[PDB]
Symmetry: D2
Subunit: 143 residues, 4 copies
């Protein structure tokens, strides 16, 4: 319905196995538009900040450790119902529970190394996009 934006991250597992293009392609094929993107290697601090709402959770240490083990691609995806449509083609967090032809089905090995991230809601998307991108970096389409 309303055109929304969501944060994608191609996680270090998918980057190291050179699946960036294949994953971007799935998004584009579903009608999401890439309106920002950049490759970064997160520092400890950078990861902890992104995930600061899970700072006191037990899983934080290993999450942070994985997400800093190699470079990631961060991207803003734009489209009708983007938050959810993105989640649709990402599929379930567990690859074993993920539908066929989702990203988790096709590219994830495990729960921890599940290939990609999408924001879980419109409020999270707004915060997550602002964590990685100045609005000045987002590139609306003009052709």
């Amino acid at each position: 319905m309303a055109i929304e934006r969501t944060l994608s991250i191609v996680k270090p597992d998918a980057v190291s196995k050179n699946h960036i293009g294949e994953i971007f392609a799935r998004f584009e094929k579903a009608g999401l538009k890439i309106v920002a993107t950049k490759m970064k290697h997160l520092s400890q601090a950078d990861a902890e900040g992104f995930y600061a709402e899970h700072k006191e959770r037990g899983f934080f240490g290993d999450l942070v450790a994985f997400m800093t083990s190699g470079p990631v691609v961060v991207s803003v995806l734009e489209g009708e119902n983007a938050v959810l449509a993105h989640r649709e083609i990402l599929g379930a967090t567990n690859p074993k529970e993920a539908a066929p032809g989702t990203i988790r089905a096709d590219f994830a090995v495990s729960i921890d190394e599940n290939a990609a991230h999408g924001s879980d809601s419109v409020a999270s998307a707004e915060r997550e996009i602002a964590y990685f991108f100045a609005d000045n970096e987002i590139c609306p389409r003009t052709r």
Copy 2:
């Protein structure tokens, strides 16, 4: 012989028609690694600076117009023989002579809108990479 780095730009035609992933997946499949990437909307000054070598050429104005008409994706590709490897994946500058399975063959409408740019030599690749990317921004593979 050696591992080289080269600059890729996805031009505004291919961005606008949501081919970023497909193009990227062609580089990755051929064994090139994406070690940096960002989307930008080039200003006139950004584009003239990049293309300064062609400043006295007939096509300069049209090139700068086209390259500033909407957002691009600039990337650093790394691999064995990457400069020329990337060039053969791209195919002929003119899409009418480009071999099948090349990016210009598959995604370019015309010589003017030819989907993507690749650095033409090692010396040129180093300047064009430096133009868009601080050395600190390129993300070597770890893991």
Copy 3:
């Protein structure tokens, strides 16, 4: 007496007459901490996005033309009462009615070329800061 963040811009006038340091020293003396900064040459699109609220005003053209005539310095100042504190240091918009020792009084040539910009409130500070800076780019103090 709450810690806030606000946007500062050193305008192309003050940049071109090399008053960046002097200006920065005023803020630091008054207690504000510089937690993000960058020099940028704004494109017309960059400037039109920042000043979007004024897009229908007759002065928009002049404003955008001046804010893109040369490089600026964009910064995030943090401190107690940061928004209005920053404003008292800047002084009145018009230099002719700004109190001696304010930024406008000492560095502004005219109303149009009034040396610097400061956010006018908390809502606008948040919007302005986010326009130029990813949260990941802001550097909280660590010693």
Copy 4:
């Protein structure tokens, strides 16, 4: 006479004591122009890359730690004889040895925490600027 470019870093000590403006002022007072600047918090990798040349040396870890202890301001300074001229203003590497009126004599505690960095030579300034800045990111004066 030859216009040169050199790298300035305001180190984590001078930042934390809010001396950035005071230091920039000295550069501009001396006729150097700030043509790029940013605040960053360097990670271990960022610093290891900058100081790669000294990596087998025995001060390397001590240097990497100090330079990651807090945020820094990295700048490109432009002017007549900028490398040597910048070096004169900084003063002797050891602030106990530094002439009065030099930023090391006036802001530096000790040889560990000497307040600012400067490129040593013209060949090294160019590598060091290229590490932190893309060519396109540096802002020549246009007004």
